[PDB]
From Swiss-Prot, chain A:
Classification of source organism: Eukaryota, Metazoa, Chordata, Craniata, Vertebrata
Signal sequence extent: none
Name of encoding gene: PRPF3
Subunit structure: Component of the precatalytic spliceosome (spliceosome B complex). Component of the U4/U6-U5 tri-snRNP complex, a building block of the precatalytic spliceosome (spliceosome B complex). The U4/U6-U5 tri-snRNP complex is composed of the U4, U6 and U5 snRNAs and at least PRPF3, PRPF4, PRPF6, PRPF8, PRPF31, SNRNP200, TXNL4A, SNRNP40, SNRPB, SNRPD1, SNRPD2, SNRPD3, SNRPE, SNRPF, SNRPG, DDX23, CD2BP2, PPIH, SNU13, EFTUD2, SART1 and USP39, plus LSM2, LSM3, LSM4, LSM5, LSM6, LSM7 and LSM8. Interacts directly with PRPF4.
Localization annotation: Nucleus; Nucleus speckle
PTM remark: Ubiquitinated. Undergoes 'Lys-63'-linked polyubiquitination by PRPF19 and deubiquitination by USP4. 'Lys-63'-linked ubiquitination increases the affinity for PRPF8 and may regulate the assembly of the U4/U6-U5 tri-snRNP complex.
Tissue note: Highly expressed in retina, liver, kidney and blood. Detected at lower levels in heart and brain.
Designated name of the protein: U4/U6 small nuclear ribonucleoprotein Prp3
Swiss-Prot record, chain B:
Residue(s) at site: Interaction with U4 snRNA and U4atac snRNA: 57, 82
Superkingdom of the organism of origin: Eukaryota
Main subcellular location of this protein, as a coarse class: nucleus
Documented effect of changing residue 76 to A: Reduces U4 snRNA-binding by about 50%
Protein's recorded name: NHP2-like protein 1
Keyword hit for Metal-binding: no
Organism of derivation: Homo sapiens
Tissue expression: Ubiquitous.
Listed GO biological process terms: box C/D snoRNP assembly; maturation of SSU-rRNA; mRNA splicing, via spliceosome; ribosomal small subunit biogenesis; single fertilization
InterPro entries in the record: eL8/uL1-like (IPR050257), H/ACA_rnp_Nhp2-like (IPR002415), Ribosomal_eL30-like_sf (IPR029064), Ribosomal_eL8-like_CS (IPR004037), Ribosomal_eL8/eL30/eS12/Gad45 (IPR004038), Ribosomal_eL8/Nhp2 (IPR018492)
GO CC terms of this entry: box C/D methylation guide snoRNP complex; dense fibrillar component; nucleolus; nucleoplasm; nucleus; precatalytic spliceosome; protein-containing complex; small-subunit processome
From Swiss-Prot, chain C:
WD repeats: 66-105, 108-155, 158-197, 200-239, 242-281, 284-324, 327-358
Annotated protein name in UniProt: U4/U6 small nuclear ribonucleoprotein Prp4
Major subcellular site: nucleus
GO aspect biological process, one term: RNA processing
Source organism of the structure: Homo sapiens (Human)
Transmembrane regions: none
Part of the full-length chain shown: 164 to 522 of 522
Disease link: Retinitis pigmentosa 70: A retinal dystrophy belonging to the group of pigmentary retinopathies. Retinitis pigmentosa is characterized by retinal pigment deposits visible on fundus examination and primary loss of rod photoreceptor cells followed by secondary loss of cone photoreceptors. Patients typically have night vision blindness and loss of midperipheral visual field. As their condition progresses, they lose their far peripheral visual field and eventually central vision as well.
Entry keyword set: Acetylation, Disease variant, mRNA processing, mRNA splicing, Nucleus, Repeat, Retinitis pigmentosa, Spliceosome, WD repeat
Keyword flag Ribonucleoprotein: no
Single GO MF descriptor: U6 snRNA binding
Record carries keyword Repeat: yes
Location in the cell: Nucleus; Nucleus speckle
GO cellular component, one term: U4/U6 x U5 tri-snRNP complex
UniProtKB/Swiss-Prot annotation, chain E:
Function: Involved in pre-mRNA splicing as component of the U4/U6-U5 tri-snRNP complex, one of the building blocks of the spliceosome. Enhances dihydrotestosterone-induced transactivation activity of AR, as well as dexamethasone-induced transactivation activity of NR3C1, but does not affect estrogen-induced transactivation.
GO BP term, example: RNA splicing
PTM field: Phosphorylated by PRP4K during spliceosome assembly.
Molecular function terms, GO-annotated: identical protein binding; protein-macromolecule adaptor activity; ribonucleoprotein complex binding; RNA binding
Official protein name in the record: Pre-mRNA-processing factor 6
Keyword Transferase annotated: no
Keyword vocabulary terms for this entry: Disease variant, mRNA processing, mRNA splicing, Nucleus, Phosphoprotein, Repeat, Retinitis pigmentosa, Spliceosome
Tissue specificity as recorded in UniProt: Widely expressed.
Segments annotated as HAT repeats: 42-74, 76-108, 208-240
Length: 37, 124, 359, 126, 294
């Protein structure tokens, strides 16, 4: 490997922008707490 | 859900399992209600583990129990409400701490071991 | 939809600095990798066999109790002469190596300290008065410590939720902090501000790791998804999809192309940045893996530790078990490897940290 | 639904059809997927399913089956995975080790073979 | 025959009988007896040569390894004794007849952190829920912090809870201005006398309750077992108490307690006394009992 993929993409694309990329659900009905007597 | 000093705060599914196990232990006469009884069971090592509610208005009145569990190697968590723990303990009054205790040859062995293994895995 | 935050000019100058610092190290790593390739296969095999014998000879040289409360993290100094142990009681302790004598007791944290990390140039080219250590506790404070003062030099406020892990950037100018607010933050020492507030995780971010070149940062989250971020561009490059439960340890190999992430599924998955895929899934332990760390210089072996009271050493790229470090009565909460690679520190819930050395 | 609990076990000698049937029948009744790879000194029993079924089957193999009939069962690993790897319980008599490795590579779980074989060589050194 | 010759008209006759027995091609037991005889009253070189001969005959003998370590430590050569102990532990492991000795040597000769590491390694290698936890607490933890010792005792009671030694260590070393009677009652649930009832007697004597302490000590000494430490403690408590005549009767009934009383030497030497230092001239036992116990 002459250069890594991140380095190859980099070498100029740097700017002042921070992303919020594709929030994914971790791998809708709450468990109702059955109250005893 | 509010106070972070109650660190081992269980989730909903584990809360259901834990309250169910507390109900069974009360049925089997293996439960000690109250913080004072939990402390007395700690000092004798006759306790499998301890459940405590994270809703005591002074919460630090039950933070000596984790520090004693560390000295006696006893699992411990926090549950979200005092009334749910009280009802799970067979007591209409709000219980803020209960202790599930040891008994040789009991039928609640496997459930207690599983709930312990789950308990000492969420502590971080 | 991926929202983009218009960062301040401090972010711009910091990212230009990151690029200018990371490019030469990237070329240096590439040249070192080439030089390693030119080495004959017989010599490499002999060195690997010697390292495997040394790791099989690993045994518990010293076992010292840290504090009356369990130890959460242990970190070696860059010179492998000092050991920093963070405790849940709020105290941090600096011990000598290998005599394990208590040298310093940093105080100022009121809650459970989660991690303490040495500055990358500490005890090497930095004065002891300067900021040499960074610690975080359950109250969210991030405190910086020198070596001549038991008192904190400064405190980094800004996190209202517990800070999980704190890691120095390889430059040491930048500090990455993980918070349960699902976001992680990069701060500057020179400007004393949070350069980069980065969300993206659906759940809390537990662990953060930095690429040795300094260009990439790996963040493990409680959402069972790890994310690789390019600091210069602020864009996530790779998502380490494949883990079931909360990721508790993320580490970059010194080779700069393998990433190891241990999860609550008791497995440690190794991924390739270049191929953008998982290369292996080690069924490491019977319990959740607390920390994953490569050998800092060459990365010949991978160290794991879990709640099964054991650590394990795995070959690289072999991924075969070499030695099972056992002897801790409590759960191994933190682990570290010396810069020279001869010493391995494991701090446990039994309130003791044990040193392992090769016979 | 939530996630598959897996355990891998190593058995030295698994040649008796009675215990083979016991494992098959109790895995089928407990609705536990997985497979058994039979090889010299390395008998890999991989079982996938639910936590309570895994607990029952673990007690089966570690506290109900007498293995000295030396030959013994050693727990190798227990964990969780998102998806199952196999369907119904299947036996594979592999004359060699590379054939079993290829079979496990078919589903992408070769690290099970890795752990089992490495533990076997480690216990043979002892 | 060697034992008879030890009490016979000549100890040189006992040495000659031991040499003749060694000339009869015996097993390692007679070899250890001969090594102890050379270690009874003679130069350390003879004992070292006997140990070398035993190793050239059979190296799988914990008694021989312990004798070699004790011989190497007799000349204050702690490094050679430690090396021999480590080699014996690696080659011929046991439960804890020598691991405790290695830990004690490491704590005395050198830093105690290495001794604690050795104790942890022994408790993790082949524990089988042993009584070495008391050694890891009393000989190691009791000499340092107190809370760490309490936690170690709690853990040692969590595993193998019916252990008499662990219960006695936790009873008399937790606290006895208070919370001691509760510990005594808890230990009484695991009813036995591995110095467990002797712990109750000691607690009663601490409270200056002469009648109850005397009754408990008599019950534990007369018929619980034929022990040495308990009998010696009862004799000391009787002499301290205002009998001055029952002390002589207790001493007579303890010296003449079941003349198969090597058990009373299997507990006095395993708790207080030693072998071949003052026991070698107690009455007769120099050659056999030294190699028998460790």
């Amino acid at each position: 490997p002459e250069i890594e993929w991140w380095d190859s993409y980099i070498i100029f694309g740097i700017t002042n922008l921070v992303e919020h990329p594709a929030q994914l659900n971790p791998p809708d009905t709450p468990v109702t707490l059955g109250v005893y007597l | 859900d509010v106070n972070p000093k109650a660190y081992p705060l269980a989730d909903a599914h584990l809360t259901k399992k834990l309250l169910d196990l507390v109900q069974q232990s009360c049925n089997y006469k293996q439960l000690r209600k109250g913080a004072n009884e939990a402390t007395k069971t700690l000092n004798r090592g006759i306790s499998e583990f301890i459940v405590m509610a994270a809703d005591a208005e002074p919460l630090e009145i039950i933070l000596h129990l984790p520090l004693l569990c560390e000295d006696k190697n006893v699992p411990y968590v926090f549950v979200r409400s005092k009334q749910a723990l009280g009802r799970a303990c067979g007591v209409s009054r709000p219980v803020i701490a209960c202790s599930v205790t040891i008994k040789e040859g009991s039928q609640l062995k496997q459930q207690i071991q599983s709930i312990q293994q789950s308990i000492e895995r969420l502590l971080v | 939809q991926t929202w983009y935050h218009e960062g301040p000019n401090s972010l711009k100058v910091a990212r230009l600095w990151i690029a200018n610092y990371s490019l030469p190290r990237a070329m240096k790593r590439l040249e070192e990798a080439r030089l390693h390739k030119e080495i004959p296969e017989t010599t490499r095999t002999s060195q690997m066999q010697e390292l495997h014998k040394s790791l099989r000879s690993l045994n518990n040289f010293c076992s010292q109790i840290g504090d009356d409360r369990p130890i959460s993290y242990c970190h070696f100094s860059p010179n492998s002469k000092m050991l920093a142990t963070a405790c849940w009681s709020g105290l941090c302790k600096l011990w000598s190596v290998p005599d394990c004598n208590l040298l310093h007791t940093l105080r100022g944290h009121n809650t459970n300290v989660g991690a303490i990390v040495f500055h990358p140039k500490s005890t090497v080219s930095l004065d002891p008065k300067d900021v040499n250590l960074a610690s975080c506790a359950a109250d969210g404070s991030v405190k910086l410590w020198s070596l001549d003062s038991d008192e904190p030099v400064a405190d980094i406020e800004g996190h209202t939720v517990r800070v999980a892990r704190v890691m120095w950037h390889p430059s040491g100018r930048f500090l990455g902090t993980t918070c349960y607010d699902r976001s992680w933050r990069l701060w500057d020492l020179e400007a004393q501000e949070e350069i980069l507030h980065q969300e993206g995780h659906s759940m809390g971010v537990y662990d953060i790791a930095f690429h040795q070149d300094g260009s990439l940062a790996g963040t493990g989250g409680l959402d069972a998804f790890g994310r690789v971020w390019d600091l210069r561009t602020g864009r996530c490059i790779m998502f380490l999809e494949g883990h079931l439960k909360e990721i508790y340890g993320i580490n970059f190999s010194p080779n700069g192309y393998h990433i190891a992430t241990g999860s609550g599924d008791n497995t440690c998955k190794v991924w390739d940045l270049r191929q953008r895929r998982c290369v292996y899934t080690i069924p490491a332990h019977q319990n959740l893996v607390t920390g994953v760390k490569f050998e800092p210089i060459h990365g010949n072996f991978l160290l794991t530790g879990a709640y099964d009271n054991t650590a394990k050493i795995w070959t690289h790229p072999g991924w075969s078990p070499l030695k099972t470090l056992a002897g801790h009565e409590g759960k191994v909460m933190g682990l570290d490897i010396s810069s020279d690679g001869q010493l391995i520190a494991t701090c446990s819930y039994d309130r003791t940290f044990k040193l392992w050395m090769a016979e | 639904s939530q996630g598959v609990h897996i355990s891998v076990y190593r058995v030295r000698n698994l040649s008796n059809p009675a215990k083979k049937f016991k494992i098959e029948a109790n895995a089928g009744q407990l609705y536990l997927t997985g497979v058994v790879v039979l090889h010299k000194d390395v008998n890999v029993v991989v079982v996938e399913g639910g936590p309570k079924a895994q607990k029952k089957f673990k007690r089966l193999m570690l506290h109900r089956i007498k293995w000295d009939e030396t030959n013994k069962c050693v727990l190798v690993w227990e964990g969780t995975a998102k998806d199952r790897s196999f369907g119904e319980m299947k036996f594979k008599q592999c004359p060699t080790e590379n054939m079993a490795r290829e079979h496990f590579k078919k589903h992408g779980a070769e690290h099970y073979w890795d752990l089992a074989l490495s533990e076997s060589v480690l216990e043979s050194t002892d | 025959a060697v034992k008879l010759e030890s009490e016979n008209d000549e100890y040189e006759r006992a040495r000659r009988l031991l040499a003749k027995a060694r000339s009869s091609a015996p097993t390692a037991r007679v070899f250890m007896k001969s090594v102890k005889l050379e270690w009874v009253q003679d130069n350390i070189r003879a004992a070292q040569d006997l140990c070398e001969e035993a190793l050239r005959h059979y190296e799988d003998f914990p008694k021989l390894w312990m004798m070699k370590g004790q011989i190497e430590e007799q000349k204050e050569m702690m490094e050679k004794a430690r090396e021999a102990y480590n080699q014996g532990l690696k080659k011929c492991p046991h439960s804890t007849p020598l691991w405790l000795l290695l830990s004690r040597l490491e704590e005395k000769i050198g830093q105690l952190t290495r001794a604690r590491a050795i104790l942890e390694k022994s408790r993790l290698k082949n524990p089988k829920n042993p009584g070495l936890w008391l050694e890891s607490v009393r000989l190691e933890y009791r000499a340092g912090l107190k809370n760490i010792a309490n936690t170690l005792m709690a853990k040692a009671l969590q595993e193998c809870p019916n252990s008499g030694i662990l219960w006695s260590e936790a009873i008399f070393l937790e606290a006895r201005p208070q919370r001691r009677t509760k510990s005594v009652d808890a230990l009484k649930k695991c009813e036995h006398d591995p110095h467990v009832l002797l712990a109750v007697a000691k607690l009663f004597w601490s409270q200056r309750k002469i009648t109850k302490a005397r009754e408990w000590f008599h019950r534990t000494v007369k018929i619980d077992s034929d022990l040495g430490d308990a009998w010696a403690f009862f004799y000391k408590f009787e002499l301290q108490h205002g009998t001055e005549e029952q002390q002589e009767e207790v001493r007579k009934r303890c010296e003449s307690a079941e003349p198969r009383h090597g058990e009373l030497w299997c507990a006095v030497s395993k708790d207080i006394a030693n072998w071949q230092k003052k026991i070698g001239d107690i009455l007769r036992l120099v050659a056999g009992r030294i190699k028998n116990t460790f």
